[PDB]
Amino acid sequence: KKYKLSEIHHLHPEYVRVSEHFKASMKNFKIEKIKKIENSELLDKFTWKKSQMKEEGKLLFYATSRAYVESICSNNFDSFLHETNENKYGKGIYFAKDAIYSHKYCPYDAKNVVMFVAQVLVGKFIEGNITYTSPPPQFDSCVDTRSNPSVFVIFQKDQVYPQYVIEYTED
């Protein structure tokens, strides 16, 4: 295996931190588990890109089916997997600022939905549209709106590191 997926205790500070980020928008939900992802290959690609970009990472959300957890932990997120926005802001990977946004735009049955926490190098962003296969020149990502974006579109895997998987159920 290319990675490790490790369950974190609920009193661990990383659990507390992730739980607070998730619960800021996921009010009618209970966290069942939080697992830490370790993939050295994906981390080295990310840390190199972070170094070249000279940007700090942003903690963003990606809701998906439990069936895809292993594919993401070993090979990173797949741009060929779409959500219900249907590439409206560019043909790339969609990461939400608020966990509730990724959850509501996830097309899978609630019982099968898990929440990824990803470190994302958004850099300079601009509004995207369906025709973009790259951000416009001098930009690193695309968004729904430049002021208070709700979603970020990433066109390169090395700008993302999957960091946590959250298991949860609706109240």
UniProtKB/Swiss-Prot annotation:
Induction, as annotated: By type I interferon (IFN) and viruses. Isoform 2 is up-regulated by 3'-PPP-RNA.
Record note on modification: Phosphorylation by GSK3-beta enhances its antiviral activity.
UniProt domain PARP catalytic: residue ranges: 1-171
Homology family: Belongs to the ARTD/PARP family.
Assembly information from the UniProt record: Homodimer or homooligomer. Homooligomerization is essential for its antiviral activity. Interacts with EXOSC5. Interacts (via N-terminal domain) with DDX17 in an RNA-independent manner. Interacts with EXOSC3, EXOSC7, DCP2 and DCP1A. Interacts with PARN in an RNA-independent manner. Interacts with XRN1 in an RNA-dependent manner. Isoform 2 interacts (via zinc-fingers) with RIGI in an RNA-dependent manner. Interacts (via N-terminal domain) with DHX30 (via N-terminus) in an RNA-independent manner.
Stated role: Antiviral protein which inhibits the replication of viruses by recruiting the cellular RNA degradation machineries to degrade the viral mRNAs. Binds to a ZAP-responsive element (ZRE) present in the target viral mRNA, recruits cellular poly(A)-specific ribonuclease PARN to remove the poly(A) tail, and the 3'-5' exoribonuclease complex exosome to degrade the RNA body from the 3'-end. It also recruits the decapping complex DCP1-DCP2 through RNA helicase p72 (DDX17) to remove the cap structure of the viral mRNA to initiate its degradation from the 5'-end.
Domain comment quoted from the record: The N-terminal domain is sufficient to bind to viral RNAs and promote their degradation. The second and fourth zinc fingers are involved in binding to specific viral RNAs. Contains a divergent PARP homology ADP-ribosyltransferase domain which lacks the structural requirements for NAD[+] binding. It is therefore inactive.
Full protein name: Zinc finger CCCH-type antiviral protein 1
Gene: ZC3HAV1
Residues of the full protein shown: 726 to 896 of 902
